[PDB]
Amino acid sequence: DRGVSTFSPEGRLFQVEYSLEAIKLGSTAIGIATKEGVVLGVEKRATSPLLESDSIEKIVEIDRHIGCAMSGLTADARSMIEHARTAAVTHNLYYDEDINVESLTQSVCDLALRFGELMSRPFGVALLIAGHDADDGYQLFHAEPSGTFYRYNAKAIGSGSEGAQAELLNEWHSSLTLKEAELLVLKILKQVMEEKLDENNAQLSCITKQDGFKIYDNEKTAELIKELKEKEAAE
Amino acid sequence: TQQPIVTGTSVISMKYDNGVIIAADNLGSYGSLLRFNGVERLIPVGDNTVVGISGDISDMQHIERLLKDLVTENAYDNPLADAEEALEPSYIFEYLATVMYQRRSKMNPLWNAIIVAGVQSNGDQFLRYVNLLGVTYSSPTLATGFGAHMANPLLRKVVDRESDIPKTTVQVAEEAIVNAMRVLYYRDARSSRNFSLAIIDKNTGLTFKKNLQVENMKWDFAKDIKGYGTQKI
Amino acid sequence: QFNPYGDNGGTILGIAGEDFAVLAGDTRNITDYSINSRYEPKVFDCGDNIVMSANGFAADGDALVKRFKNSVKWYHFDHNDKKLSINSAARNIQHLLYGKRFFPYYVHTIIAGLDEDGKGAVYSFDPVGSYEREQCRAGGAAASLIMPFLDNQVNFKNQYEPGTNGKVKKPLKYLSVEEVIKLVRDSFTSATERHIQVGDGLEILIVTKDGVRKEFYELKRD
Amino acid sequence: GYDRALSIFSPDGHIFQVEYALEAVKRGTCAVGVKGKNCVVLGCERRSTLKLQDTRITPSKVSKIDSHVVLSFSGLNADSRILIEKARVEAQSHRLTLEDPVTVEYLTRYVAGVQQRYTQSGGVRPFGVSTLIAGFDPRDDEPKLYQTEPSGIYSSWSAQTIGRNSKTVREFLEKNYDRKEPPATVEECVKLTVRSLLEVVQTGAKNIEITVVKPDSDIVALSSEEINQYVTQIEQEKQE
Amino acid sequence: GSRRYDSRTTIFSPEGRLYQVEYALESISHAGTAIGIMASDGIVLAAERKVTSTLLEQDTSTEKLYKLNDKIAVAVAGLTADAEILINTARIHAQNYLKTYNEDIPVEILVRRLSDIKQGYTQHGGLRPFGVSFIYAGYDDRYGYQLYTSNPSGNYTGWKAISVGANTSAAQTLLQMDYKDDMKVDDAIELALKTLSKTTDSSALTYDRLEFATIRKGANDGEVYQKIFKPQEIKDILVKTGIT
Amino acid sequence: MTDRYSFSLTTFSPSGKLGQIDYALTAVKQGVTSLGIKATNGVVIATEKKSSSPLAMSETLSKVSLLTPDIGAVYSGMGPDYRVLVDKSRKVAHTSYKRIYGEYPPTKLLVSEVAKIMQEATQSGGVRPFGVSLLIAGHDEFNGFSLYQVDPSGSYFPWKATAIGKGSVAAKTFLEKRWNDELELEDAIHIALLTLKESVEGEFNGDTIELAIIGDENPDLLGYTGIPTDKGPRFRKLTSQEINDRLEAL
Amino acid sequence: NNYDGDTVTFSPTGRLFQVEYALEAIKQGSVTVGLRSNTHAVLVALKRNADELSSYQKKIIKCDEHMGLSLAGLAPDARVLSNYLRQQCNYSSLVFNRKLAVERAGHLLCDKAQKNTQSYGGRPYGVGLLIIGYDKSGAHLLEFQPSGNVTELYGTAIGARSQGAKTYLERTLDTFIKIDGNPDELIKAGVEAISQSLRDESLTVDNLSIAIVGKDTPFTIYDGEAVAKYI
Amino acid sequence: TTTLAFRFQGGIIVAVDSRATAGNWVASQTVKKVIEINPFLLGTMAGGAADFQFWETWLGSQCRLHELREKERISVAAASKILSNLVYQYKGAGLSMGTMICGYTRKEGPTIYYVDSDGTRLKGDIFCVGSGQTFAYGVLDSNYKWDLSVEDALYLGKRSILAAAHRDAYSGGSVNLYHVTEDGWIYHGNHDVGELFWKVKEEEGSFNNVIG
Ligand SMILES: *C(=O)[C@]1([C@@H](O)C(C)C)NC(=O)[C@H](C)[C@@H]1O
Ligand SMILES: [Mg+2]
């Protein structure tokens, strides 16, 4: 057939480019970074009404100061999360301190290109890694299966990514509050989702310096959805 | 873990105003048997370094081959091998020191005590010690084995501290070394009269002296000594 | 049988001030009854406003210091030139030491510097990695001669206030850098008199917010 | 060793070997899982093309992983044995180290992890098996029902079906299963499970297997006559 | 590199089938028919040797029926060489179990072990599967008399009566017709031979074209005896049942 | 480097055929005719010494090989494959039997070990099957005299008499008419020579024919005396002269 | 065509297409400039962003106190190669108490990239590197290609539109080589050089990335408002 | 070394001394023999100081990974067994450890596990480990009841260390007190034995043999 680590004539790795197509098919995940915190939100996308939606875990804790949201072949993310958690805890063991968000992201991205003929193929999942440290403050990173990671003020990944990113282009500014960011994620998720957005088919989370990483209750998110509807009807 | 078989005794050395001097006798002992009388224990590396080795001779010959191999390797893909990127005394020492400590850490040591004497690029004197344990230290005077006990005291009367180095000429320094070698011949039971001496000067370069002998020895007073106490005849 | 360990003698002393820290050590290096060197530096600046000394078997002491300096370098590479805090350095050294738990670095390690609040800090290690933050610690050959003196003159142990007769302790007033250096010098002068492996020279490294400063003093050479 | 990357991406972003493993599950006999208020029931289809079979010794479709958890499947029979064995070993290993039996979610996560590992390991193909894992956590009376598939994704279900004609029985369950009020008793839950299989099975004779799991390691498999009574009652009510 | 020449033996078709397993089964369908029939007082194993010669030394020959231990035997359908590799592995597992627990291995445990080995060759290693289908005839004190079959996929099932190899469709229909649960060994012997006699591709069924065996409790008191039939004994049972 | 061919080169085709084994049998068919006949008091194996060049010394090329003192082998097909199999067969007779039981293996078990080696080349990674069919004749105390055929697949069958290679179909027919259960060894040798003459085109004599027997114990070939139980090898390769003597009474 | 399936296959004209495709990844990468005088060596790199919300991808990596490089192409491959350099620089210091020569650093990179082009299974590195350094023979600038070819130069540029900056340096050769004991003027020349490779976009405060090493100057990177001086 | 820990109505009391000795030489009077594994778990130091610090800090890392993966607080049984299984792998190598893994969970209640470098793992109500263990046991056994108050339990643990500190040459310096509840441990201060001895002597009337 052909090699797994083969270059295309354009100078790209076939398998990496193909894994990006799998991520486009995945459910939407959005992250917004502010000076009061970073917000992470996801589309759950249950394949059937009998599926208990609360068991869909597409937002995940790495450490108290680092959270993570995923999009694509979510099964592939489990070993990435495992490595991330281990890397975070291991660094705390060696250095008696929290690990920098960038350093954690870099550790995860080192796995990405360890494939050949090591694992047999690249990861089919993208990650939004959000967190806080004392050096660089609140941060949001986008970790791809290419091994590359970009820092973002705001970022959307998944099926409604390019539409959501264009919306994040206009809406984001440097003086956003945490509450403003929460509503903004819900607004854009609702825009790109097939089904109607509610507290059962969408999930919110955030990371603050004081309280650390927290996944939002369905009751808490429901209020933010109701607050959104009213403010959109206000004009 | 082994035991040393064929052994070499004291290596002695000191700094002077423009460089360093190092010396060692030409004997390879086999226990109490003075087996081999033509053994060179000062091994020059380039024109700026001399490595003096004591202890096990088979391990010395191994170290000698490593240094020979080091010069070859430094020349590979190196247009400045005989200029800016030539081997320094500090490079050669650190290499040996690494090897000695690694070998002791595998419980299979090179059974030696080594003194690397030389002059650096900037004219600075280099003189540092390393042994089978990987222990390292530097001093205006350095000596191994019996030399540590008998040579250092004499050499320290010339250069007692750092500030005495510029005040010490090459003639005074060489005189002290040669006298020390005589004292070691009087008192070390595993030493020989024949020895080699090396001077590394920042101006005149490397001067390697072979086939030196201990001379001007005092023995005449022995004729008067009789018995072990009461005996008169 | 081959014995991979040796004793190079020497003595070191770390004292933590209010907004400073000192790590001192004699410059004599020995084996048995012979002097190897009268000036062989034992306390080292390791960067990031940390000073370190690994007293005992000098080969293991040099190996450890070398590996820690190396750890500081790679900490900068791996974590965006972040400053290695003294508490983080201490934990890192534990893992270096315990890594050779069953063939130990035969040294008593001490590091000194400033904590993240700017206060003076000294950490003390055993050969196999057990460590602890301390206000005062002498290590090495003459440690048994120095520590009791420091308990008395730094922490005012067994000292009470005149007139009260054992009822009121002497208050733990803070010592200046000039006052600490006096106690360090007298500790080493006294140790030199009564311990054969201590002498030749004293080298002190003082750590403040401004950086690392050095001071050298002569000791008796007998 | 054999290192060939069998599971790989295609231009459209699909891993065909994982997708073809799902087609093997589609071929497999139907399996259904329904959780009530205080129980879970696992229904399984037995194709009647094979008669002259010895039902005493023939491998049963539902397998105990521990005394409190069970596993049924659809797809390749030989592949399922490997997952069941690994799961059984991990269940005892968990008891040995944590001094507590596995939760149903943990056991599911482990099996799903094994399945995932085979989708990006060299020299191996994915498992041609989807599983339904059911039971009750230690000292807990809340019913648990999870599903896994070759890709390695897993999730919890109020009720679910897998295998051939699973589309039809899922259609049935979606209209007949109420979340606000699930099957209150064992009878109601078993009845709904048999009903859902009768949409697909053909004959209600020896073609239906039922296994009821209750809290505190109370697992029992229904016999032919017991199931036949449910089949009789369902069709008699239907004649109206 | 080497990738160019790799057949990829362990992959799925678009339909979700294992190519090599399916083709191995096609190979087995051309092999000599083997039949197992389980009765209340024993088990019968009958099998047809493939187009033999008059110069073949029959009395010392063994291509179909093999002994795994004193309690368990197998009938082979497919590549004889492949079967012997597996047979020797099975013989060892039985002895390992006997050494460990000091009890004869239960039939199913032995069958599962061999079936798991076959499974491994379909999921990993990049090697071709074993082109063999077994009929396991055995006895233990838990389930009593048992018949199993395993195929290259690694899947195994239990049976009252079963055929493997050539003309299984025709053979299985004939067995399904005349088999009953209260049947005895002597009756099962007759059924096995009658079934082969009708499904055979040969002109007539003779003693030299057959291998035969029975596992009976027909041994002195509570114990089990394996009887691998000799050429003369197969000739006698053919006359007795009225086939020749 | 590394042997990166860790996958099977022999696989099932849609029709259920194992191609490489079939093709190996085709290579055996092209090979020179060899045969074996079993008598009441012995076994004979024979083949034609097809000399590649008259300058070549055909005595150095041994088509008939001793495996044990009581077991011999002959082949049809690829000679080099045969040579290595004989080396492995001799070694395995020691490692997996003689060094354990202190005696040489019986014919059937040695054959079984050879078959195993040939089966593995039919399934293992990065190898083709052996392109030979072996005829192994032998004797042992409890089984008596025996003759076995071994194919590239690893399958083996016992024979009263048989032939393999070029003219096997015609040769087997000839053997069916002549063979009976009351044959003496000399009678089997006579029949072997008659059968082999049909498949040979050119010269037919002791120098162009290789023939060996498994018969009575040969104490003269043992190499030592003093142990009554050691009576010598039953394998004996017939000389050029011994063959020609029987060709006169042909 | 038929000879580009893997790195182990020569074409009929004697070409290695997988290596050439890896070379193509560098041309797609953002522009970076390298130049030196007798006292100092400078790296100037145009960082690329994904969009307006994203950060600008870092282009320059430090390898030692006296050595570092700028990248263009697959950033993860640069991380692997820079990590290898860090180790080799570090091995030289620990074992020989010797700073690694810049020329010898290039030789090591060449040999590491080569092994990936001759063996089956692996792939060539998809990145180009510009290594600057100051060692015992003064200032140095190297250009690394993943074919294995390493070249010592006065100045150069790699990445998209790099030909414009490379021509400028070829004209300015005689001027910028003489900029001794003046780091600011040498950087100015580097910033003016990389400006020849710009179209549409211009050098902003978080766009530009500069690094310098010299006689009494450790390898230091300048980003953010630290490079506003040179805009 | 004197360390104790006992279960009671109000949870667990943990009490330790502070002395470290190398032969007759008192290396430190301010050693921390209670490791704060996490906000709900505690561990004690006896035998090897490094072995305790290293492996129980490591234990805290394993407990953190457990609750990240399982979304649930680790049990005291599971935490203790992780440590005991670890040291058992090292059995023979020369690890030196004697510790009480102390915790308070919902499913277990207050639990204490004695863990040993010989691989021993024992659940129990009262444990004393160290060179001065026999002295502490005497005070504990004669005064212990399940229905002790938090105030009286804290004092009993303090007094039992004092008893050992006095008699055992290798114990002393100061007393560290902890009180373990379901919502976590609570530190109850460092108490110098020098000052505590005289305070206790006067207020309690004990140590009449000693002149004060
Ligand atoms: C206590 O166990 C002890 C303390 O020094 C350490 C600090 C825990 N360990 C010992 O080995 C000696 C004997 C002390 O009792
Ligand atoms: Mg003194």
PDB file of C-alpha atoms in Angstrom, chain H residues 76-189:
ATOM      1  CA  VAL H  76      -7.794   4.389  53.576  1.00  0.00           C
ATOM      2  CA  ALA H  77      -7.668   0.650  52.822  1.00  0.00           C
ATOM      3  CA  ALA H  78      -6.696   1.287  49.187  1.00  0.00           C
ATOM      4  CA  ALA H  79      -4.159   4.011  50.027  1.00  0.00           C
ATOM      5  CA  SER H  80      -2.444   1.866  52.670  1.00  0.00           C
ATOM      6  CA  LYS H  81      -2.362  -1.148  50.338  1.00  0.00           C
ATOM      7  CA  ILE H  82      -0.713   0.876  47.548  1.00  0.00           C
ATOM      8  CA  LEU H  83       2.140   1.646  49.970  1.00  0.00           C
ATOM      9  CA  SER H  84       2.361  -1.876  51.443  1.00  0.00           C
ATOM     10  CA  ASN H  85       2.394  -3.495  47.980  1.00  0.00           C
ATOM     11  CA  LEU H  86       5.148  -1.071  46.940  1.00  0.00           C
ATOM     12  CA  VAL H  87       7.473  -1.778  49.886  1.00  0.00           C
ATOM     13  CA  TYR H  88       6.808  -5.516  49.470  1.00  0.00           C
ATOM     14  CA  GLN H  89       8.366  -5.338  45.980  1.00  0.00           C
ATOM     15  CA  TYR H  90      11.452  -3.838  47.668  1.00  0.00           C
ATOM     16  CA  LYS H  91      11.463  -6.484  50.431  1.00  0.00           C
ATOM     17  CA  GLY H  92      15.041  -7.601  51.137  1.00  0.00           C
ATOM     18  CA  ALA H  93      16.617  -4.500  49.560  1.00  0.00           C
ATOM     19  CA  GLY H  94      16.839  -2.796  52.972  1.00  0.00           C
ATOM     20  CA  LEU H  95      13.977  -0.285  53.178  1.00  0.00           C
ATOM     21  CA  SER H  96      13.230   0.773  56.764  1.00  0.00           C
ATOM     22  CA  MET H  97       9.638   1.803  57.469  1.00  0.00           C
ATOM     23  CA  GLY H  98       7.039   1.668  60.236  1.00  0.00           C
ATOM     24  CA  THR H  99       4.029   3.891  59.598  1.00  0.00           C
ATOM     25  CA  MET H 100       0.374   4.439  60.479  1.00  0.00           C
ATOM     26  CA  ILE H 101      -1.705   5.461  57.464  1.00  0.00           C
ATOM     27  CA  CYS H 102      -4.547   7.405  59.099  1.00  0.00           C
ATOM     28  CA  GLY H 103      -7.773   8.619  57.476  1.00  0.00           C
ATOM     29  CA  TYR H 104     -11.522   9.182  57.804  1.00  0.00           C
ATOM     30  CA  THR H 105     -13.896   8.321  54.931  1.00  0.00           C
ATOM     31  CA  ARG H 106     -17.665   7.844  54.566  1.00  0.00           C
ATOM     32  CA  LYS H 107     -17.678   4.105  53.805  1.00  0.00           C
ATOM     33  CA  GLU H 108     -14.979   3.154  56.366  1.00  0.00           C
ATOM     34  CA  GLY H 109     -15.216   5.772  59.121  1.00  0.00           C
ATOM     35  CA  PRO H 110     -12.001   6.545  61.006  1.00  0.00           C
ATOM     36  CA  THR H 111      -9.391   3.960  59.966  1.00  0.00           C
ATOM     37  CA  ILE H 112      -5.747   3.293  60.881  1.00  0.00           C
ATOM     38  CA  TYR H 113      -3.470   0.916  58.963  1.00  0.00           C
ATOM     39  CA  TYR H 114      -0.047  -0.041  60.321  1.00  0.00           C
ATOM     40  CA  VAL H 115       2.276  -0.525  57.321  1.00  0.00           C
ATOM     41  CA  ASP H 116       5.709  -2.138  57.550  1.00  0.00           C
ATOM     42  CA  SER H 117       8.830  -2.515  55.381  1.00  0.00           C
ATOM     43  CA  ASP H 118       8.509  -6.289  55.955  1.00  0.00           C
ATOM     44  CA  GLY H 119       5.226  -6.065  53.999  1.00  0.00           C
ATOM     45  CA  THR H 120       2.990  -6.209  57.079  1.00  0.00           C
ATOM     46  CA  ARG H 121      -0.356  -4.415  56.778  1.00  0.00           C
ATOM     47  CA  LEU H 122      -2.624  -4.377  59.844  1.00  0.00           C
ATOM     48  CA  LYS H 123      -5.881  -2.554  60.495  1.00  0.00           C
ATOM     49  CA  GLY H 124      -6.276  -1.562  64.153  1.00  0.00           C
ATOM     50  CA  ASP H 125      -7.619   0.804  66.807  1.00  0.00           C
ATOM     51  CA  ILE H 126      -4.363   1.686  68.622  1.00  0.00           C
ATOM     52  CA  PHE H 127      -0.787   1.653  67.281  1.00  0.00           C
ATOM     53  CA  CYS H 128       2.575   2.771  68.677  1.00  0.00           C
ATOM     54  CA  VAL H 129       5.790   2.609  66.650  1.00  0.00           C
ATOM     55  CA  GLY H 130       9.380   3.550  67.500  1.00  0.00           C
ATOM     56  CA  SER H 131      12.146   3.098  70.078  1.00  0.00           C
ATOM     57  CA  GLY H 132       9.851   4.676  72.703  1.00  0.00           C
ATOM     58  CA  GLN H 133       6.692   2.776  71.717  1.00  0.00           C
ATOM     59  CA  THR H 134       6.469   0.695  74.924  1.00  0.00           C
ATOM     60  CA  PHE H 135       6.368   3.857  77.068  1.00  0.00           C
ATOM     61  CA  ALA H 136       3.566   5.367  74.979  1.00  0.00           C
ATOM     62  CA  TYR H 137       1.603   2.076  75.022  1.00  0.00           C
ATOM     63  CA  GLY H 138       1.583   2.110  78.849  1.00  0.00           C
ATOM     64  CA  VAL H 139      -0.149   5.488  79.090  1.00  0.00           C
ATOM     65  CA  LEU H 140      -2.502   4.719  76.170  1.00  0.00           C
ATOM     66  CA  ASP H 141      -3.688   1.285  77.348  1.00  0.00           C
ATOM     67  CA  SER H 142      -4.471   2.411  80.915  1.00  0.00           C
ATOM     68  CA  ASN H 143      -6.345   5.593  79.871  1.00  0.00           C
ATOM     69  CA  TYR H 144      -7.953   4.743  76.498  1.00  0.00           C
ATOM     70  CA  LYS H 145     -11.734   4.676  75.991  1.00  0.00           C
ATOM     71  CA  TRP H 146     -13.795   4.926  72.786  1.00  0.00           C
ATOM     72  CA  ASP H 147     -15.922   7.694  74.366  1.00  0.00           C
ATOM     73  CA  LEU H 148     -13.052  10.160  74.903  1.00  0.00           C
ATOM     74  CA  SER H 149     -13.641  13.824  74.068  1.00  0.00           C
ATOM     75  CA  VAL H 150     -11.566  15.508  71.345  1.00  0.00           C
ATOM     76  CA  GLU H 151      -9.964  17.646  74.086  1.00  0.00           C
ATOM     77  CA  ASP H 152      -9.089  14.670  76.331  1.00  0.00           C
ATOM     78  CA  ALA H 153      -8.002  12.484  73.400  1.00  0.00           C
ATOM     79  CA  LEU H 154      -5.594  15.191  72.184  1.00  0.00           C
ATOM     80  CA  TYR H 155      -4.113  15.439  75.692  1.00  0.00           C
ATOM     81  CA  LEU H 156      -3.752  11.647  76.051  1.00  0.00           C
ATOM     82  CA  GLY H 157      -1.742  11.496  72.813  1.00  0.00           C
ATOM     83  CA  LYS H 158       0.356  14.464  73.943  1.00  0.00           C
ATOM     84  CA  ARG H 159       0.943  12.941  77.396  1.00  0.00           C
ATOM     85  CA  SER H 160       1.849   9.531  75.938  1.00  0.00           C
ATOM     86  CA  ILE H 161       4.582  11.048  73.747  1.00  0.00           C
ATOM     87  CA  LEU H 162       5.840  12.993  76.776  1.00  0.00           C
ATOM     88  CA  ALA H 163       6.069   9.715  78.724  1.00  0.00           C
ATOM     89  CA  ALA H 164       8.294   8.235  76.000  1.00  0.00           C
ATOM     90  CA  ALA H 165      10.238  11.469  75.412  1.00  0.00           C
ATOM     91  CA  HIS H 166      11.259  11.417  79.088  1.00  0.00           C
ATOM     92  CA  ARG H 167      12.410   7.789  79.347  1.00  0.00           C
ATOM     93  CA  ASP H 168      13.503   6.957  75.779  1.00  0.00           C
ATOM     94  CA  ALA H 169      16.863   8.575  74.999  1.00  0.00           C
ATOM     95  CA  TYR H 170      16.159   8.564  71.235  1.00  0.00           C
ATOM     96  CA  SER H 171      12.817  10.406  71.590  1.00  0.00           C
ATOM     97  CA  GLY H 172      12.082  14.038  72.458  1.00  0.00           C
ATOM     98  CA  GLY H 173      12.455  17.577  71.125  1.00  0.00           C
ATOM     99  CA  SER H 174       8.789  18.469  70.712  1.00  0.00           C
ATOM    100  CA  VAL H 175       5.308  16.986  70.265  1.00  0.00           C
ATOM    101  CA  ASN H 176       3.210  17.421  67.110  1.00  0.00           C
ATOM    102  CA  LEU H 177      -0.551  16.835  67.427  1.00  0.00           C
ATOM    103  CA  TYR H 178      -3.103  16.092  64.716  1.00  0.00           C
ATOM    104  CA  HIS H 179      -6.832  15.366  64.886  1.00  0.00           C
ATOM    105  CA  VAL H 180      -8.384  13.568  61.910  1.00  0.00           C
ATOM    106  CA  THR H 181     -12.065  14.208  61.099  1.00  0.00           C
ATOM    107  CA  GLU H 182     -14.187  13.286  58.061  1.00  0.00           C
ATOM    108  CA  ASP H 183     -13.796  16.826  56.649  1.00  0.00           C
ATOM    109  CA  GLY H 184     -10.000  16.459  56.998  1.00  0.00           C
ATOM    110  CA  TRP H 185      -7.165  16.599  59.517  1.00  0.00           C
ATOM    111  CA  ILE H 186      -6.673  19.528  61.893  1.00  0.00           C
ATOM    112  CA  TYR H 187      -3.220  20.513  63.175  1.00  0.00           C
ATOM    113  CA  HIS H 188      -3.056  21.037  66.955  1.00  0.00           C
ATOM    114  CA  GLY H 189       0.361  22.677  67.259  1.00  0.00           C
TER     115      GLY H 189
END
